[PDB]
Amino acid sequence: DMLFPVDNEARQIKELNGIWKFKRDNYYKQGFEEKWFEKPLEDVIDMPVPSSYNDITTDQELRDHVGWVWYERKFAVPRLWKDQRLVLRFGSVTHHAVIYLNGKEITRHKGGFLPFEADVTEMANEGENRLTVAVGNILEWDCLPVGHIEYMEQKFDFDFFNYSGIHRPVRLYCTPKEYIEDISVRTTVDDKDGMVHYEIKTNAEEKFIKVYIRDEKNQVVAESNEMKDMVLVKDAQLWQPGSAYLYKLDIYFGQDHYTLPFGIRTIQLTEKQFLINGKPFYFKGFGKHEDSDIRGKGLDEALNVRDCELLKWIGANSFRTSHYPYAEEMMQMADQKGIVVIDEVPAVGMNFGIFTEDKVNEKTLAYHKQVLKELYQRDKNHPCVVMWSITNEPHSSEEASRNYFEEVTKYIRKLDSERPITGTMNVDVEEDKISQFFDVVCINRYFGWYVGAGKIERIYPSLKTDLIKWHEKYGKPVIVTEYGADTIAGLHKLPEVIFSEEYQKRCIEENNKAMDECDFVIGEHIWAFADFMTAFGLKRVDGNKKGIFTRERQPKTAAFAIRERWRKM
Amino acid sequence: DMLFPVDNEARQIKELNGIWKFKRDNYYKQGFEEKWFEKPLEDVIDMPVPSSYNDITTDQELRDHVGWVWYERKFAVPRLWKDQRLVLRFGSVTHHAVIYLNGKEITRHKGGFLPFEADVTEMANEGENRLTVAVGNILEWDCLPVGHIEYMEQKFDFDFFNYSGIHRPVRLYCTPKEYIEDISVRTTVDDKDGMVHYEIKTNAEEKFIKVYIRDEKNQVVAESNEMKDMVLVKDAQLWQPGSAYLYKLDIYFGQDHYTLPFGIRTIQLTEKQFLINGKPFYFKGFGKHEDSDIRGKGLDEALNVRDCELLKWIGANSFRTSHYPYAEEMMQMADQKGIVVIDEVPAVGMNFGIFTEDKVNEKTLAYHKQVLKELYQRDKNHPCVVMWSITNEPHSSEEASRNYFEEVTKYIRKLDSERPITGTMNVDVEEDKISQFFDVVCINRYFGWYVGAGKIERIYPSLKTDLIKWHEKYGKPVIVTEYGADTIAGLHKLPEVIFSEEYQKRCIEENNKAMDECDFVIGEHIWAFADFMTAFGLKRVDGNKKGIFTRERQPKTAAFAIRERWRKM
Ligand SMILES: [Ca+2]
Ligand SMILES: [Ca+2]
């Protein structure tokens, strides 16, 4: 149950962002042992919310902290909210949360990239309250992303910095006590007419509802009094890639009111094409990251607008949420700009045996299904989402992974019978044991970088050969979901060398030549959109330098050649 | 015989540098099999000499060439040289040479860092002559440095670019037909008095000779008519680190004349000290390279003066010739500037079983002794050379390496009974099997970089422990011959991260703290002096970035903290 909070005449949002008080444990779980939540925090510093905490201070100990940290602020409940339902919402807490209201625990959460909330109607006092949030960053074999602890040092095999903090907005909001809990929308098209299937869940199903469908002019085009209905939109304005159209499911229920934007669009996979509204779609874009200077993974909407301007400028039509769900604000923006999205759960780091009883096991599986349920509940109504990605680069050569991912694939397909399912490959085509469960084959391939570094002449034959093998083995359309080269801005050389701006351009260009000679490729996603931070390592010059743009969102040389190609496509 | 050529009333040098014609093979050994030397080269480009050829052109195929290339120019013999002995000298040809004069082969050479010559008295014509030089860059298991060919790709394990070309001056010179062939000088000191032991070898030994010893104002201070003698120098000005004094052995022999600079200084080792003229010497400096922009490993005397100015500025007193003998010009400069040198043979890359019948074997051994003989013959008379280094980072954990390096160390001790012998370690101290053969133990250690990257607080405990183990195992004084961290100029961060300027400074500090607590450490050589080029690899951002100075010889931040330490030491 996770409708995005709204403001209208009936519902109201109180943002709890700004500056909080903050302190870290000085030994493992010190805050829980000493019950720091039972009184205000002492010996604290300021910490912005939303933001990672790791890059804010000058303190290497805080940057590299392993374990739990403690946030605290105060909030008020006005007299005017006296008889309302009160909800405290967290867009995310990375990775693990324990929430305390006035010294008492009210909820917990596992998973750093999906929202959660707590009903505090009967617990919050009028006037001042104290909100205390314990934030833990430890990843074990039953978390997503996967990791483990050694003796404490945090180990993991994914390539992005394990930022921790309150990365997304914290909201206290009110609704009437009889209210709209959940909404599902599915759409079909018969030539010119759209059909809108909706289902609305309330906590008083016998009472009266009024449902409108409004166009972008806010004009009513359909109307009903049923909580579940199928309604026809004559001459429907379809939601198109690069040309969004959003209708509004506008719902009056008792004293309550909720308005849900949605797009009318169809998806169909053929043998070798990806069809949106019947017309072939070729993915041009990037896997991204929630990453920028100072604030780590913290939501930054000005950064988001800049990134969308860059995506439009360079001719991209799509992105993948590597390697975790992004903020709903980004998903709303993609809905509005007509950007096509591959939505991914954080099942990353399942690589180096990995699928064994003492590591990635049935407990990991059950949590993997739960994360998918939550992702679906949050994003099921976004027209921008066209595909679910259930994993990034698992060690799928292991025979034990076959049963694991058959279970995961069956689960998401039971939740959602309409969008294709996929996941990205890094093992050899000959060894993979899971891609047969997918509708689209996605491969991460770094010819000219991790294979044959510097050997420009070998990139084109290498990727073409591999692509054909992937198509011959599975007979499905193929997306190259990652390829590129680390590139230091300002590093030029003639003849070109790895890390130079010229090499990045040539590397991408030869990979593209291989893709252009295949008839079953339905997309190219360059890695990476922008330089981002990684865990420290000798192959990472202050992070991952595969960005086509710098971390400050300025283009390297290759960006202009990619634009010339994508704008002609 | 390898006396450095001189100009005087009796001997004359003609430099053959400038711009040659140049062309590479298009398939393996093409010029040999098509017999290109028989006529002037056709379809050629210009190539400077001395210089590597790899970074001169815009052509990747030449930069990465494997095999042979061809150089050619014309030279003149003047009428005035009619009755002289004529010698063609190459300072070096990297790696393999075949020399042709007017289309006939006159000599060959294996080894890219030591000089060779050919008597051309009987073959050169008056007036114009055609000089053709085939230059090969293939390294095999019995070459130094070590490498091997796979299927044609060059493999090797050392960490510097395999530049090829004619890196040092080419000289045609004349002497009388009866002439001075070789000179050896050894010195002892008795209070304030030097004894100069010398031994002159000539072309006609029964004839009469006159030997003067001259001070720096050109005044005779000893004299003799013997080919072999000891002559006393009372109140002898000693050659001192940082304050050089050079006498001259001035020899007249028939029509011939040769003047040999030399220095009076003594070396002695105790179990905790390195004594030069009785005073303890603590090595402060760097392993270097012959490397600069555009010209690869080509000799550049302006660059050498700038380097020596920077060594003086930073308070360095020494360098090691990593990992091959340097140009004699640099050795003369060290003689004149009072810089102490560890002189090293190119026995690098014997690492990844290495010491096996099929790899490093008896052929490599015999060649290793041969290069030591040649290095000793060239540099025996340099006061700046205080120690021979016979290897860099061999895989000396193999039992088979024990007998190998016992042979090598025995041999160099037979050539030179006065200078200490060493070789640099990278294997674990518990595994090493050869350092008992050395007079000084030298270790390459990168705590904070290759071990425990980024963990500043573990550098000091890690190196101190390792240092004490090396001393406990062998009971000899220890030089840390390499330590440091890759550093991108302009990369700053707070807190610091690997690759940042601030990290390089802290990493060297913590290593220095460990050395300051170990009384048996007699030297600290930072790696590296200046950023230099490497074979391409994902850990090498346009080469090796451990330079304290940039490749263009400007300091990074850590240079100023090093200077403070070394100048007050
Ligand atoms: Ca959010
Ligand atoms: Ca020379």
Automatic annotation (TrEMBL), chains A, B:
Enzyme Commission code(s) on record: 3.2.1.31
Enzyme superclass (EC): hydrolase
Binding positions for Ca(2+) per the UniProt entry: 328-329
Top-level taxonomic group: Bacteria
UniProt name for this protein: Beta-glucuronidase
Organism the protein comes from: uncultured Clostridium sp
Gene (UniProt): uidA_2
Entry keyword set: Calcium, Glycosidase, Hydrolase, Metal-binding
